[PDB]
Amino acid sequence: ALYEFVGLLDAHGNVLEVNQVALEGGGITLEEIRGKPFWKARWWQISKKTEATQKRLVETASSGEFVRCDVEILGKSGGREVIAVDFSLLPICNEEGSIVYLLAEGRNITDKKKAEAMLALK
Amino acid sequence: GAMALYEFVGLLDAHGNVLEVNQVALEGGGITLEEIRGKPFWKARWWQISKKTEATQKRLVETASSGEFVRCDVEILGKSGGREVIAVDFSLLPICNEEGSIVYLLAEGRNITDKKKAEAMLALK
């Protein structure tokens, strides 16, 4: 559905723009994180594993690969509280096909109706 | 400095309705996001120098909405809270999702006013 959180990154994952709702959820101001890697921002700082995971998702998108996965973030009450989020990274190319930005999107799934994945039988 | 690499940017939906705009663009136009959110980009005050400028921006957004990349120079009410005209190198990038469907348009612009002034001076014969 239309995102709840959204951010624009350059192709190295550095933060360019972030909507107010995401900044309020993480307890972060844009000026504090702008120009620096997205994985360093507080949303991704539950642990060294969550940080590393997000750096890896940014590397995958920076390569042209679309990312979608459920993740946990410090994303509620000014960075105090963990929420689960459906998270996506869209590589944005220019007319020649070179990746120039990344779009980070998320929606809070903490109250979303419990859903079943499609699992292979084999 | 380090951040000079980017100036105005906005995120539109696939039909050009406004979703997000950065503060440099809003302050330069004297516009708040709430006056323009969910309504066509070409109705926002940057593009209202005349009916011509508005009609061209609507064409540019329809071009990008069809999946084509747009870049060209334009003039906007984009300095001193919308009070002054600046020339801008303006681009719209259609953004596709994983299935290849257009989901958003990225609007970017850089102020090239001093740049055109300099080109005109170097052009003097």
Author numbering:
A (entry chain B): 42 to 163
B (entry chain A): 39 to 163
Sentences from the study reporting this entry:
TodS/TodT, a two-component signal transduction system, is responsible for regulation of tod operon expression in P. putida strains. The structure of each PAS1 domain is very similar to those described for other PAS domain structures, which consist of a five-stranded antiparallel β-sheet and three α-helices spanning residues 45–149.
The shape of the region is somewhat similar to those of benzene-derived compounds, including toluene and 1,2,4-TMB. It may also be possible that a cellular ligand, such as an aromatic compound, was co-purified with PAS1 protein. In the absence of a signal effector, the PAS1 sensor domain cannot provide a signal to HK1 via the flexible nature of the STR.
